[PDB]
């Protein structure tokens with residue numbers, strides 16, 4: 001149920017996505033993260049940006065206190081926000097996340113995105129900052145050495161951006177993973193091949209087609225789970241299009257996140273371990289790739305470090 005990371009730690013291959021939009025009451029993250037642990041999720045994905053680390057933390061603490069799980073059974077990820085890339089800001093950001101969650105360590109700390117921000121303009125484009133991410137990475141390594149994070153990694157990096165870290169003089173720890181948008185309409189095959197060649201785990205987010213946030217996502221973009229190929233695979237397997245999309249990533253060797261704030265769907269998504277897709281099913285899903293990143297807004301697309 002886990003994969004061994006390149007620093008010797010283990011990451012469960014199914015993770016629970018904890019982001020919900022601002023209109024969902026903060027209290028809901030506490031309820032649903034408890035439900036996710038009850039259903040059998042052990043990898044829990046959060047971030048400073050999600051404004052939910054207090055609630056997600058309390059859910060973890062509550063399920064430890066009631067005997068359901070031990071802390072060593074949970075794999076909890078947080079992430080460094082883009083206004084904290086200057087290296088002197090990295091360990092204080094991580095300490096803040098640890099304080100909000102009331103944890104002694106995170107299992108994984110990620111650079112959330114390569115697009116550094118000043119610690120929006122009149123045009124509505126984010127105000128970029130120019131930071132050498134190798135210096136941010138050195139600060140992340142110091143966080144692992146201090147024991148604040150068991151493992152460190154990155155998110156939203158392209159090949160070139162990952163290479164800059166991998167080729168850094170005096171590198172101490174490689175990133176254990178690159179968490180990126182990844183689903184049948186944007187399957188990141190070339191990037192997955194590169195990550196495998198460097199023993200970096202690719203972690204898929206928006207694997208179910210994202211929450212379609214108006215800020216970032218064109219409403220005209222076709223809806224992943226209404227795709228007829230996925231719908232026909234779901235009917236053939238007597239599963240659901242979400243379970244087809246999750247199973248596809250596991251069979252490729254990608255670790256997959258799934259967000260749900262619905263009790264039935266949370267319980268459904270752990271069924272991904274209960275069935276397999278055939279070679280022909282996998283080829284049919286591979287045929288859907290159309291270079292569609294749902295995140296697609298003017299506000300980021302002209303950032304100097306935009307990864308697409």
Ligand SMILES: NC(=O)c1ccc[n+]([C@@H]2O[C@H](COP(=O)([O-])OP(=O)(O)OC[C@H]3O[C@@H](n4cnc5c(N)ncnc54)[C@H](OP(=O)(O)O)[C@@H]3O)[C@@H](O)[C@H]2O)c1
Pocket residue numbers: 016017018019020045046112155156179180204205206207208209210211225240242243257258259260261262265266268269
């Ligand atoms: N690193 C980054 O830059 C980044 C960016 C985006 C997301 N993430 C992480 O990835 C997590 C997952 O991505 P995401 O939030 O974009 O959502 P997602 O996992 O793609 O899920 C999209 C929608 O699928 C629905 N859903 C879940 N299970 C389903 C099922 N069995 N059947 C039908 N619909 C189902 C959910 O709605 P209901 O809640 O109504 O079930 C959810 O809103 C996020 O929560 C966050 O942890 C990271």
Ligand SMILES: COc1ccc2c(c1)c(CC(=O)O)c(C)n2C(=O)c1ccc(Cl)cc1
Pocket residue numbers: 019049082112113115181206210211212213216293294295
């Ligand atoms: C589908 O593509 C994305 C990409 C990033 C997303 C989201 C969706 C959502 C919403 C969702 O998950 O559907 C959130 C909240 N994102 C962020 O966390 C985020 C992280 C880094 C940056 Cl620089 C900007 C935004």
